[PDB]
């Protein structure tokens, strides 16, 4: 089905922000978090592009929403919850499962477990990304999480996702990086990508892509992509972490 807003729907672009998840984990061990289940075992997989998970899909600000004195960084870290509005229940980090269940079906629910391995269970990422980024918008909670999980199979599949499988554990440049992602989707679109890491030597640990909210429902294009100012910490190179910590 179609990912379409009901409310609230005048914003420029979505962030599908995906996790480089054994990074992901080593800097939630490297900062001493408590370890998620998700993470615990570090166990490795065939596809090393199957480590590029699904964090969230995340609309931008709202022009409706801007036009009562709320800014990015307000709506960046309450989304739904922004007040004045749209002012819903806020998500809270520390205890996801406290949001609402989102309804998504048993055939969604499985699929997006296979690509978000915090979904569900006791870990309920899927509830707290819903509560932040979608309740406040009518999305369709299947089409919404069928959409991240489509989106992320087309980066993964693409040259981007390549590059990260065949670069698995390496160190990597964003020369080499931008070269990969510009054979699949464009040299022009290079700058949609914001690339985070942490750590010293620093690797990476989440990739977020720009994309066009009226291009969100069809397959990813050299069209569908907005470049940004942003390319994130990464520096000119880093290491693609490898399971284990
Ligand atoms: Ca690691």
Redesign the pocket.
């Known amino acids: 089905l179609a990912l379409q807003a009901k409310q609230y729907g005048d914003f420029d672009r979505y962030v599908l922000a995906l996790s480089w998840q ?2 992901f ?2 800097s939630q061990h490297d900062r001493n978090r408590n370890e998620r289940d998700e993470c615990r075992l ?1 166990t490795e997989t065939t596809n090393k592009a199957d480590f590029l998970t699904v964090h969230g899909l995340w609309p931008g600000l709202p022009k409706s929403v801007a036009a009562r004195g709320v800014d990015e960084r307000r709506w960046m870290r309450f989304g739904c919850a922004t007040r004045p509005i749209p002012n819903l229940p806020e998500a809270r980090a520390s205890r996801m499962c406290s949001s609402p269940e989102t309804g998504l079906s048993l055939e969604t629910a499985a699929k997006l477990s296979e690509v978000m391995p915090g979904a569900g269970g006791r870990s309920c990422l899927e509830r707290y990304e819903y509560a932040k980024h979608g309740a406040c918008f009518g999305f369709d909670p299947d089409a919404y999480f069928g959409t991240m999980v489509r989106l992320n199979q087309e980066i993964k599949e693409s040259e981007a996702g390549k590059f990260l499988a065949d670069n698995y554990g390496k160190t990597v440049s964003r020369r080499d990086f931008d070269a990969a992602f510009a054979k699949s989707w464009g040299k022009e679109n290079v700058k949609a990508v914001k690339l985070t890491c942490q750590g010293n030597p620093a ?1 990476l640990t989440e990739i977020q892509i720009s994309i066009k909210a009226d291009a969100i429902n069809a397959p990813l294009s050299a069209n569908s992509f907005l470049p940004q100012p942003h390319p994130g910490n990464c520096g000119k190179t880093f290491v693609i ?5």
Do not use: L, R
């Open positions: 054994t990074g984990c080593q570090q690797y972490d490898k399971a284990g910590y």
